């Protein structure tokens, strides 16, 4: 369906295969966009379920069960791109041995797109596709989210690394309570509280814990991609949009008359370009799709009728992830809102 994403992914694993993970190493913007594109094209490989094997609860088994993973053209093309050099490199990686950046990225992305957990068990077994047991399916999906994040955090703890983060795609958060996964992953692992370990993942899960997935009457804007939908009541940092797999070019619907700044691309003079929208209804970005080295995904909510506790998520230096890994900020103790003279308005 999309071979360009696979080619870019392969080239980036070859480039980063020998790059050791240091204390402040972070995924470059280009690599992050490559990961984003590969995940979203894996999702687009199968746009709808088969009516003969549809899950009555509505869970997206098309990206969870092996019955549909093995039918995805994208998965087969990526595992057999150029005689499967990536697949051969994958069959030797393990949570407890990854030391390089390329290994980290390859293992996480291949586990995700193969419908596999880190311990080898599938996300959802082929016999539970047409199941009605809500608790079992929900627990399986919740375990998939928790295990992806926990695997990333255990890597970061072993390598003593900060700012590495890939994120769990939105489809894995089906009936998943963000607060429950956040507390399960941070009250059972005391070593994860260190201020030098996985702060991007910390910010991702903290935001997903304070903000629920579905806010009925407290939503300000909605994302939908392939029907998988999310609602936000706060400024949406780029790490959240990148972890969930939502682009600013997807369908955004706007429920109030607030002003949003949709950051779109990085321009010259070390700035960012944004669009402003105020009307209720759909939000349409008429600009061309940016390249992987300058793509940006973030939304700022101007509203002032909100708690001051979560206003730092809209700060420019936190909403937009820094190119320099050491300048990235993930908490209110380091958030700062400076340097708007470099930004420009498109529309």
């Amino acid at each position, epitope marked *: 369906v999309n071979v360009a994403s696979i080619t870019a992914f392969k080239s980036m694993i070859d480039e980063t295969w020998d790059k050791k993970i240091e204390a402040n190493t972070c995924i470059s913007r280009k690599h992050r966009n490559i990961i984003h594109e590969v995940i979203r094209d894996f999702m687009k490989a199968y746009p709808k379920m088969d009516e003969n094997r549809k899950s009555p609860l509505g869970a997206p088994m098309q990206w969870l069960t*092996q019955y549909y993973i093995l039918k995805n053209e994208y998965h087969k093309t990526m595992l057999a791109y150029d005689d499967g050099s990536l697949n051969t490199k994958f*069959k030797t990686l393990n949570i407890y041995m990854i030391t390089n950046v390329g290994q980290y990225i390859l293992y996480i992305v291949f*586990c995700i797109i193969s419908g596999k957990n*880190h*311990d*080898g068990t*599938p996300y959802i*077994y082929d016999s539970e596709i047409t199941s009605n047991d809500k608790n079992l399916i929900n627990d399986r999906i919740k375990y998939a989210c*928790k*295990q992806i994040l926990h695997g990333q955090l255990t890597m970061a703890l072993r390598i003593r690394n900060k700012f590495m983060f890939i994120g769990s795609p939105m489809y894995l958060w089906f009936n998943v309570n963000g607060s429950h996964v956040y507390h399960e992953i941070y009250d059972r692992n005391v070593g994860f509280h260190n201020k030098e370990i996985g702060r991007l993942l910390y910010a991702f899960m903290y935001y997903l814990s304070i903000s629920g997935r579905f806010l009925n009457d407290l939503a300000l804007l909605k994302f939908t991609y392939l029907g998988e939908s999310w609602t936000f009541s706060l400024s949406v940092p780029e790490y959240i949009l990148y972890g969930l797999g939502y682009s600013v070019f997807d369908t955004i619907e706007k429920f109030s008359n607030d002003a949003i700044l949709v950051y779109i691309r990085t321009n010259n003079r070390n700035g960012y370009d944004y669009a402003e929208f105020n009307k209720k209804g759909i939000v349409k970005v008429t600009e061309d799709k940016p390249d992987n080295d300058k793509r940006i995904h973030a939304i700022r909510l101007i509203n002032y009728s909100s708690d001051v506790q979560h206003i730092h998520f809209g700060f420019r230096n936190t909403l937009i992830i820094d190119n320099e890994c050491t300048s990235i900020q993930s908490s209110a103790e380091n958030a700062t809102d400076t340097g708007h003279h470099q930004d420009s308005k498109i529309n």
Partner: antibody
Amino acid sequence: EVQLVQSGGGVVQPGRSLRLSCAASGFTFSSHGMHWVRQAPGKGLEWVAVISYDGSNEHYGDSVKGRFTISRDNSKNTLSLQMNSLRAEDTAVYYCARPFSYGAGYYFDSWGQGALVTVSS
Amino acid sequence: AIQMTQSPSSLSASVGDRVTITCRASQNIDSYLNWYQQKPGEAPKLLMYAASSLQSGVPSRFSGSGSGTDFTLIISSLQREDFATYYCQQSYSTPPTFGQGTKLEIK
């Protein structure tokens, strides 16, 4: 040195219940999943069950589905298998096998000594 | 699940002979096959952790081949310590079927 020790084998009448245990040592038990495999006397190996590193995900073989429950206690490093509706078909030596993951697959790198369960009267 | 079938069920070979235990899969397992050796009265030991992939401490005489739906384990020179049962286990999809073992007997 990874080492898995098992206990709770013995005799139980058909239809009754038994509880196997497998105390792990020498590795971070809280991070690795665990599997159970049985071997009927003189027959091939058969997969029984799996439990995730925390205990929120588990699966059982088709033949044993609905009669066993696998649990783990990450504070004591204990892996237990609950036996119900025991048939004569279930007489076997039971091993707890720790999986070592490579790629999307895995292989059993550590096996227990084997606890014999005999369903006979 | 994916069924595992080995051939032959039993094999007779002398010291220094060549043996080829073949494992077939019902569906594609994509190089996810592990071979175990079990001496009588002992737990299985891993020999190859993937198709044509060896484990630490395994003698180099053991060798592997296969690319899904067909795999082979070859012992170039059978020493007296290599007379045991061999199981082919797929790990592409849980349940990990173990396959009917092959027993090697001295001739």
